[PDB]
Amino acid sequence: MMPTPVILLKEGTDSSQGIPQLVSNISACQVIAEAVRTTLGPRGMDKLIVDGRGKATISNDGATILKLLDVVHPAAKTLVDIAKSQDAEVGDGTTSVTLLAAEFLKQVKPYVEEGLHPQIIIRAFRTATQLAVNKIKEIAVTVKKADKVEQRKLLEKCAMTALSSKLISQQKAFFAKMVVDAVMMLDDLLQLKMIGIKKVQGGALEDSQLVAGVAFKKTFSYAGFEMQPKKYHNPKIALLNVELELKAEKDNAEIRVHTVEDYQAIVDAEWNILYDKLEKIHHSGAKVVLSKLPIGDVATQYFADRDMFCAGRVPEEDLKRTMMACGGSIQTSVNALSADVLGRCQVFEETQIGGERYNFFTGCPKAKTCTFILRGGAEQFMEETERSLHDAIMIVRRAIKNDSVVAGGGAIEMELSKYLRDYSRTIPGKQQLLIGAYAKALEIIPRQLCDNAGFDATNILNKLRARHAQGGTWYGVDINNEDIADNFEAFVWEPAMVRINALTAASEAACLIVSVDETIKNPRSTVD
Amino acid sequence: ASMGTLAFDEYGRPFLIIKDQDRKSRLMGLEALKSHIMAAKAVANTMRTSLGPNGLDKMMVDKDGDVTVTNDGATILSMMDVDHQIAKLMVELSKSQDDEIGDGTTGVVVLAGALLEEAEQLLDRGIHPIRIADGYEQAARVAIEHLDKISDSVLVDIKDTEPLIQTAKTTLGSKVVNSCHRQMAEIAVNAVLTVADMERRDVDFELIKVEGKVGGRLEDTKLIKGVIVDKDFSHPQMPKKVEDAKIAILTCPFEPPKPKTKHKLDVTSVEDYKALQKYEKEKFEEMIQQIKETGANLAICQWGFDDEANHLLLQNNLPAVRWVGGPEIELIAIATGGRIVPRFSELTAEKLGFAGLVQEISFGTTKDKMLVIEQCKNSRAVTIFIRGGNKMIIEEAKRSLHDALCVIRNLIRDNRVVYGGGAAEISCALAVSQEADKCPTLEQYAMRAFADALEVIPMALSENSGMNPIQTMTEVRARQVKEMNPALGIDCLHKGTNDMKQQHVIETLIGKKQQISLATQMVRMILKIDDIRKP
Amino acid sequence: SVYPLTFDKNENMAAKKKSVAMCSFTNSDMQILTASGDGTCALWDVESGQLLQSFHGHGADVLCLDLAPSETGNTFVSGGKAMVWDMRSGQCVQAFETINSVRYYPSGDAFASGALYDLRADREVA
Amino acid sequence: LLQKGIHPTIISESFQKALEKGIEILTDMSRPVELSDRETLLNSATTSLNSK
Ligand SMILES: Nc1ncnc2c1ncn2[C@@H]1O[C@H](COP(=O)(O)OP(=O)(O)O)[C@@H](O)[C@H]1O
Ligand SMILES: Nc1ncnc2c1ncn2[C@@H]1O[C@H](COP(=O)(O)OP(=O)(O)O)[C@@H](O)[C@H]1O
């Protein structure tokens, strides 16, 4: 190089180009994939990440682990992005996507080092991915009967498969039944905001319950609250968005009087306004009053004197769930509290759960919402239980959308690898090597499963390859018996969309990484 | 073993992946498990000396220098300044046990430490930690089923409080209040039974007010079936004792009314000024006369009041107290059976509470006065007033009494008990032992490790009592095997018998089951962690 | 904040700033409120110039304090611990313990202490 | 052993007894060898070099 008295780019700009740059990109992708390798399979392990604030997060979820890592390598961030994409679109497979992408890049690295043109590799990946997706759609097993029992069993099996890698895998049948029950009560959109997740410290995992209704924590009761009865047997619920307090009529309001009689009249008028609101609420027949805005002590004592229940400052989403379950309407005005806008539940009760008070609305027959109350011995315990249940919920929702399943345990990918190898053996030969590399790369997941289980990956892979070649589509890794088994008959079921999205995203990430040849890093501005 | 990956590329170019990766540490594989296991072992061994009647207390000092002398394991772990993440997990486990049950916050830590200690030597022989966790889950299920099998029911009725008093005494035995043991157990049982929904429903601890004042003696602690207020009569010359008091509860200050909205009252002439003065005087007289009309012998406010109202209250023979807090207002209304009135115009005779005695209490040469309201008709709220020679024993008595209240609450929720002193642990270990023999070989090691970890509680009890742990534990286990009697435990008090039936060492089944469950789940969670990425 | 050496004014009818300091203007502009490093609050009558009454209730020094929404003869939240006093009786009528600064909520039922307490429940609300 | 409540002197004497018994057992398993037996010497050398 030369000093170049006036330089072209700003001083401090770093540029890397050529084969070394792409090889380094592949190595960075390998490094990222290594961080989630041991989290895959029933024998997977959890990771603990501590941030600068000292708060530790414990997760088996690949997307969460990748997000927590402060990745700054531009090529490595693609793996995190595709993990986020897989979590958003599907909700499961956030580790398989990264493993597949890194394995693709690793398999094609030797060809890159030989000077092979990246466009050829990109075309080979596109062809292989299209063929693999078509094969998945072709061989996916579906039942065209719409049988309720069969559909529920399929959903439960999919939830169990999605759950048999987390800390709650011991109670996976229990939690899968809970998740299927929760999802089946959503109406048509399967909105996630309609499934509440409450975490209460203390108690065992089996103590966790699903409320066929709505439940939320007690919200800063005022004085006189303890005189209110805490159990009703057919209450009418008045959902309100109203501040039941003595307060200024308006922010800009001002009262100008010149007589003590008018002063007393104004005071009595404020009191009468509050009491008129309370009386309009009371005459509606409602026994439980929930408000999004604060309810004052005067209103609390007024309701206590009438054997009523009040709870102010209820969170908005909890009020929405209460409306969806009991079947009323949130009223910003109490002037027309007809029976149409009043909720109704069979039993309302306030009980204690692990040192916290919760309000229970059970017995709703037309409920379109749920509430999970999760019990655990630690904060991160409950958080990871929530993450596992979220994975199961996404899986069950996707299965509701389309009941197409493929066998897990790597069986689907071994079948895809065999199909792609057979296809590659019938092409000129420049694309043959790359498609064969793709097929070999698809074998990472069963190998990773065997490695995590402490198995002999080579022997299991050889047996799987021979079995698939000689006949058998759903033969995968059997973790319990340290052998191979028909995973379809073992009910290791995954929705086809999970693997479809995984292959698509991994191929797109690999093609994007390979397509780059130069990286330019401008100097940081305002480093401070 | 640390610093993660560091290659700087196979071409010499910079190789940066994670922001500030050269100042971050990482543990991988079995070394992380060993570090976590030894950290948990250290925490558990610190806790294990405070187990049982002979356990010793810990002296906690916070960052401000304040001193806390306590035996409560949850409190000790909460006040301990830990940085290791597994220690934080132990602290959270203790807090969870305290929240769900309230008793046995030390047994969970010791059990988890023993479980991880056994899992360490199981890992050294080449067993996947997930397999150890599965074996622990199976053994925990077996132990819980056995606990249900050997459980015994007790009577929770108020006509016979002997089993409840025995359970409270067992809970309080390890605490410093064992000098006043029976009195403390009696007051705890009476307090829980007084404020509770009888149909096996919950117990609202907000109805139990626990107050501690230094001075006096620990034996002076008593249960008051009313409310203790940290206030006194407003005017110094009002009578200090009211009998058969008709109590008026008010949340309106004895001041001229003012609108909440921004208001300006315009005085435009001398006649307006005279009218305003007359209105003020008449408002004071009217509120006092309205209070007097209902027949009240005593008025309790929440927002204080000014001199004119004070002198009118004194003049009309109406004792009154001001600035009573909201929770205290609620407790007084509940105990006295009277409603809470928001303004004078709404005050009637039927809203008056009734108390047999309202008195002002002095506390020696201290200038402090506190009000007592008691002798109510059907008081549904109680106050536990704790006295002691120093504030530290007062705090310890507070938390010990909270433990007793939690235990009686658990008995209210479920009335099945299991005899303590290590008898439950020994029987569960035996049951896991037989259930391991039938099980195939691979899970046998995990089940027997679970049994050995369960055996730590009787050994810890024996060691704390000066007795030889292994010999006594083996003898008691052999005695349990010989004659079918799961009530044989460790004679910590050297009463001469190992039968906890006669020694009346009684613990709630819910507490034992919750201990086993929480310990197993935390151990599994720790066993599943294999990487640490501290900054 | 110290006023100018002579306030640089001539017959403004409000040059009587006083502030002898031998603080915060109360709403009824007849009294002045001083807290020192000893942890004791002081009430002075600006007209007479006399120390009305003191408020020895803070073991730690009162870094900040705030006044009632109006004259109100009471409130006086003082942040050493948050303590509420009543000038009609001179006692800590209401105390809190869970201080950068204390600000009273204009509604009158609460106050915010400095990285919120409710007076009608003796408990933190936010 | 110490955690069980055993003085670290009973452990030492018991370990001495176990060592003596183990010496007896190892001597029992032993087989006489003659330096003329070249095959055994070669096998011993190969076993020594196996791990290197
Ligand atoms: N019972 C099982 N037996 C064998 N393999 C399983 C079983 N359950 C799940 N798997 C495998 O685990 C993989 C997914 O692991 P997991 O961590 O649960 O989700 P992710 O795909 O997000 O990593 C799937 O490829 C599936 O084949
Ligand atoms: N009188 C007694 N005799 C024998 N053992 C007892 C006696 N009282 C308590 N224990 C035992 O001491 C153990 C510890 O109880 P304690 O220290 O009171 O609470 P924690 O379980 O929180 O440590 C219990 O498991 C119990 O079995």
Ligand SMILES: [Mg+2]
């Ligand atoms: Mg999954």
Ligand SMILES: [Mg+2]
């Ligand atoms: Mg105890």
